[PDB]
RNA sequence: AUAUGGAUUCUUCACGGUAACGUAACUGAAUGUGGAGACGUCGGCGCGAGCCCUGGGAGGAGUUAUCUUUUCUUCUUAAC
C-alpha cells in the first residue's frame, strides 16, 4: 500500500528541476538530523537526449544521445509519483547521504549515473523515462 | 571596433538551496508565447522628501536708563 520505494519514478515539481523526471534511490520517511521532513535521495536527467533519425550519421548520433544527470535530495511534497519503475542496483551504492555534503563525491557519483543512464537509453527500455515532458 | 583578465570545457555548453530562490560570468536560428510601454475619479490611513517649529554648542550683528544666559543671522552636501 506504500509506493515510495527505491525504484519508483517521480516528476520533480519545484527547484530548478521542475518538470524533470527522476527515480527514487533511497527514501527517508521519518526525517533525519538535517531535512526534518520526509525526503528521498533521487537521481534524474538534466539534459534529455535529442531525437534521432536514420539520416543522422554515426558522428552525430553519439553527440545527440548524450545525457546530463544530476543527484538531489527532494522533499516528498515536491515530487509527483508515477506508475513506472527503474532498477537502481547499478548505482545504488554511489548515491547516499555521504555522497552529498562533499563536492568531490558529488561529481564521482554523477559520472557513475551517467554511464548507467546512457546504457539504459541504448537498447531502448524505460522509454517514458528518457522522453522529455512537454509543458 | 577589438585585446587581456576572469568564467567554462576530457561527463562538452556553470553550480548552490527541501523550497521560495541565489550569483561577476555560465551556446540558442526559424517560429511561437508572454511581460513592460499602458493609463478614471474620490475618500481616509501608513511611510518618505522639502519646508515650518524648537534644544545644546562654535562664530558675527543688534538692543542695553532698567530688564532680557536675550533679539537676528551662518553651521550646506548633486548626478552617479
Amino acid at each position: 500500500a506504500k509506493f515510495l520505494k527505491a525504484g519508483k519514478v517521480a516528476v520533480v515539481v519545484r527547484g530548478r528541476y521542475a518538470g524533470k523526471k527522476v527515480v527514487i534511490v533511497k527514501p527517508h520517511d521519518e526525517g533525519s538530523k538535517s531535512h526534518p521532513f520526509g525526503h528521498a535521495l533521487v537521481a534524474g536527467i538534466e539534459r534529455y537526449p535529442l531525437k534521432v533519425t536514420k539520416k543522422h550519421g554515426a558522428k552525430k548520433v553519439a553527440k545527440r544521445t548524450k545525457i546530463k544527470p544530476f543527484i538531489k535530495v527532494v522533499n516528498y511534497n515536491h515530487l509527483l509519483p508515477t506508475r513506472y519503475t527503474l532498477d537502481v542496483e547499478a548505482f545504488k551504492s554511489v548515491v547516499s547521504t555521504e555522497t552529498f555534503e562533499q563536492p568531490s563525491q558529488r561529481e564521482e557519483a554523477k559520472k557513475v549515473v551517467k554511464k548507467a543512464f546512457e546504457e539504459r537509453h541504448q537498447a531502448g527500455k524505460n522509454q517514458w523515462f528518457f522522453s522529455k515532458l512537454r509543458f
Side-chain angles (χ1 to χ4, degrees):
Chain A
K2 179 172 298 183
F3 52 91
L4 295 176
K5 286 294 175 297
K8 180 55 66 182
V9 167
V11 178
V12 183
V13 189
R14 297 184 188 265
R16 185 160 76 91
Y17 292 138
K20 299 297 176 59
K21 301 174 179 178
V22 88
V23 55
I24 299 176
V25 179
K26 291 176 183 177
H28 293 151
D29 299 334
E30 48 276 354
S32 301
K33 53 179 183 301
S34 59
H35 316 134
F37 44 82
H39 66 270
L41 310 183
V42 301
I45 296 178
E46 189 181 353
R47 188 192 317 277
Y48 292 89
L50 299 179
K51 185 186 183 63
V52 180
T53 63
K54 58 173 174 293
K55 67 182 298 178
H56 299 293
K59 196 66 61 179
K60 190 174 295 182
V61 167
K63 178 182 172 300
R64 295 176 62 89
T65 50
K66 294 301 181 59
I67 305 176
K68 188 173 187 293
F70 67 90
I71 52 182
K72 187 67 179 183
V73 185
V74 186
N75 192 329
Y76 283 166
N77 291 118
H78 301 151
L79 288 177
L80 179 63
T82 74
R83 66 182 176 94
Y84 307 93
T85 182
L86 202 153
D87 191 69
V88 308
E89 290 168 318
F91 52 84
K92 174 183 52 56
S93 62
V94 300
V95 182
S96 59
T97 55
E98 181 63 24
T99 294
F100 289 80
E101 58 94 33
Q102 191 73 11
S104 63
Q105 301 188 27
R106 286 173 178 257
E107 187 176 5
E108 300 297 309
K110 284 187 291 179
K111 61 173 56 180
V112 171
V113 178
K114 185 186 182 65
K115 172 175 297 299
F117 277 172
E118 290 183 3
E119 294 178 357
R120 188 88 63 175
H121 187 63
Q122 302 288 342
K125 50 180 179 177
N126 302 122
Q127 295 177 356
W128 192 91
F129 183 76
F130 297 107
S131 182
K132 179 179 179 178
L133 185 65
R134 301 300 182 177
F135 64 95

